[PDB]
C-alpha cells in the first residue's frame, strides 16, 4: 500500500495540472471506491515550476518535442523517462519526471487525445513503484521531500 500512496500522489498531481487549465479529470480512489497526496502535490508543484522557468530559459517548450499520437505515446514516455534516470535517481530528477508527465497529459488534452491522460497516469504510477520507490524510501520517503518545500 506504499504503492497506493504513489498512485494517489500521481492522480492528484495530474488532476490539479489539468484542473488549472480547465479540463476536469479525476482518478483518486481515496473514497467511494492535509493528506499525503495533497501536501506532496504542493511541493511537486513548486519544485516543478522552478524547473520550468529554468528549462524554458534555454529551450523550446517541451510540448513541441512530443509528437503526440496514441501510437507514439508509450514510446515517448518510456524513452524520455529511461533517459532521465539512466545513471541515477535524485529528487530533482523525480521532480522533472512529474513535470514531464504533466505536459504529456496537458498535450494529450490539447491534441484531442484525452484518453491518453489515463495511460500516462498509470505509466507514471508503475514507473514510480517499480524504479523510484526504493530510492525515495532510502532518502526519507516523501516526507523528506515535502519538508524541503516548507
Amino acid at each position: 500500500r506504499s504503492g497506493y500512496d504513489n498512485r494517489e500522489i500521481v492522480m492528484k498531481y495530474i488532476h490539479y495540472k489539468l484542473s488549472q487549465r480547465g479540463y476536469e479529470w479525476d482518478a483518486g480512489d481515496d473514497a467511494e471506491e492535509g493528506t499525503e497526496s495533497e501536501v506532496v502535490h504542493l511541493a511537486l508543484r513548486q519544485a516543478g515550476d522552478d524547473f520550468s522557468r529554468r528549462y524554458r530559459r534555454d529551450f523550446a517548450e517541451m510540448s513541441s518535442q512530443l509528437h503526440l499520437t496514441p501510437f507514439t505515446a508509450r514510446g515517448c514516455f518510456a524513452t524520455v523517462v529511461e533517459e532521465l534516470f539512466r545513471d541515477g535517481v535524485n529528487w530533482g530528477r523525480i521532480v522533472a519526471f512529474f513535470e514531464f508527465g504533466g505536459v504529456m497529459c496537458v498535450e494529450s488534452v490539447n491534441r484531442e487525445m484525452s484518453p491518453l491522460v489515463d495511460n500516462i497516469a498509470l505509466w507514471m504510477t508503475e514507473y514510480l513503484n517499480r524504479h523510484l520507490h526504493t530510492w525515495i524510501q532510502d532518502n526519507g520517503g516523501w516526507d523528506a521531500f515535502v519538508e524541503l518545500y516548507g
Binding site: 519544485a47 529551450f59 522533472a96
Partner: peptide, 26 residues
C-alpha cells in the same frame, strides 16, 4: 510501426535537455 527516427531523435534530445536542467535537491 512506426515511430520516425526524426521523432525518436526529438525524444532523445528532450531527455538530455531535461537532465541538464535538473537540480539534484529539487
Amino acid at each position: 510501426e512506426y515511430i520516425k527516427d526524426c521523432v525518436f531523435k526529438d525524444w532523445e534530445e528532450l531527455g538530455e535537455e531535461i537532465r541538464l536542467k535538473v537540480f539534484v535537491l529539487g
